[PDB]
Amino acid sequence: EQGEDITSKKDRGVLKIVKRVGNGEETPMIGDKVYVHYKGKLSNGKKFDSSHDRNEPFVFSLGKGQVIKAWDIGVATMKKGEICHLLCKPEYAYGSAGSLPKIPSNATLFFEIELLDFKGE
Amino acid sequence: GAMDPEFMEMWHEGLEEASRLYFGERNVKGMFEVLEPLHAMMERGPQTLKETSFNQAYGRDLMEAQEWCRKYMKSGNVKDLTQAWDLYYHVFRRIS
Numbered sequence: 001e002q003g004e005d006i007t008s009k010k011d012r013g014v015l016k017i018v019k020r021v022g023n024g025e026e027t028p029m030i031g032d033k034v035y036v037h038y039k040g041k042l043s044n045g046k047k048f049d050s051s052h053d054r055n056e057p058f059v060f061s062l063g064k065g066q067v068i069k070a071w072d073i074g075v076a077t078m079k080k081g082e083i084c085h086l087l088c089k090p091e092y093a094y095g096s097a098g099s100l101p102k103i104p105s106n107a108t109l110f111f112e113i114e115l116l117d118f119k120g121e
Numbered sequence: 122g123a124m125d126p127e128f129m130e131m132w133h134e135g136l137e138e139a140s141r142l143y144f145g146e147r148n149v150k151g152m153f154e155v156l157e158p159l160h161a162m163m164e165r166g167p168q169t170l171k172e173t174s175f176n177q178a179y180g181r182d183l184m185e186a187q188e189w190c191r192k193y194m195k196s197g198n199v200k201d202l203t204q205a206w207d208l209y210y211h212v213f214r215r216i217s
């Protein structure tokens with residue numbers, strides 16, 4: 001494992017690495033609409049998804065549980081333009097149920113996330 | 122009059138719920154029970170200005186999503202259902 005623990009419990013559940021420094025002072029706030037590109041990989045490096053296959057940035061509302069916990073925690077720490085890598089333990093991802101067929105039970109996930117933009121609503 | 126729901130609201134609420142059933146509760150059956158009446162209502166066609174705009178903007182995408190779901194029924198390949206949800210998401214993010 002490599003990365004800085006960004007969990008509030010400091011349980012090493014979500015470890016972050018900055019791949020490209022962004023441009024804010026500002027990080028997105030609860031409820032903001034956030035626009036990202038991303039890639040997701042299993043712990044063996046196998047890709048399970050890339051945002052680019054949908055031909056536009058992925059959008060979700062931050063801090064509402066629309067996405068797995070690791071993303072709500074990780075994206076809240078990012079600045080506009082940043083790229084980071086998140087290592088996500090199963091307790092902060094899909095847990096024992098997984099996200100079949102691609103994601104098994106008890107899977108640690110890797111995401112690369114580029115924060116493109118965020119707005120208040 | 123005012124209480125009669127129209128295309129945009131029915132799809133917004135329905136996609137939300139179908140997605141909770143599928144991604145949240147792993148309930149493909151329930152997901153289909155929500156989506157099928159929504160596609161079936163599109164067949165009656167737009168009955169208002171708002172519905173005609175909605176149908177012009179989103180009708181083709183929803184009909185494609187139904188095609189991917191019908192394929193899933195035969196293939197069982199979850200990638201087919203994923204294609205459908207990319208289209209439902211594409212519609213949902215624009216109406217919401």
Ligand SMILES: CO[C@H]1C[C@@H]2CC[C@@H](C)[C@@](O)(O2)C(=O)C(=O)N2CCCC[C@H]2C(=O)O[C@H]([C@H](C)C[C@@H]2CC[C@@H](O)[C@H](OC)C2)CC(=O)[C@H](C)/C=C(\C)[C@@H](O)[C@@H](OC)C(=O)[C@H](C)C[C@H](C)/C=C/C=C/C=C/1C
Binds near residue numbers: 069099103207210
């Ligand atoms: C086709 O591709 C899928 C995404 C795929 C599914 C399979 C996974 C491997 C994956 O490949 O994404 C993936 O890479 C992944 O793990 N993702 C996607 C990127 C964000 C992080 C993670 C995730 O949390 O996905 C999410 C994960 C799979 C499920 C959620 C995890 C958190 C939990 O609290 C939620 O309970 C409900 C369920 C999926 C999403 O990010 C989408 C956007 C969100 C939802 C479905 C729910 O939040 C839903 O709740 C009602 C909503 O409020 C939405 C906005 C309502 C509208 C109509 C539905 C849109 C559906 C879009 C679906 C999309 C583009």
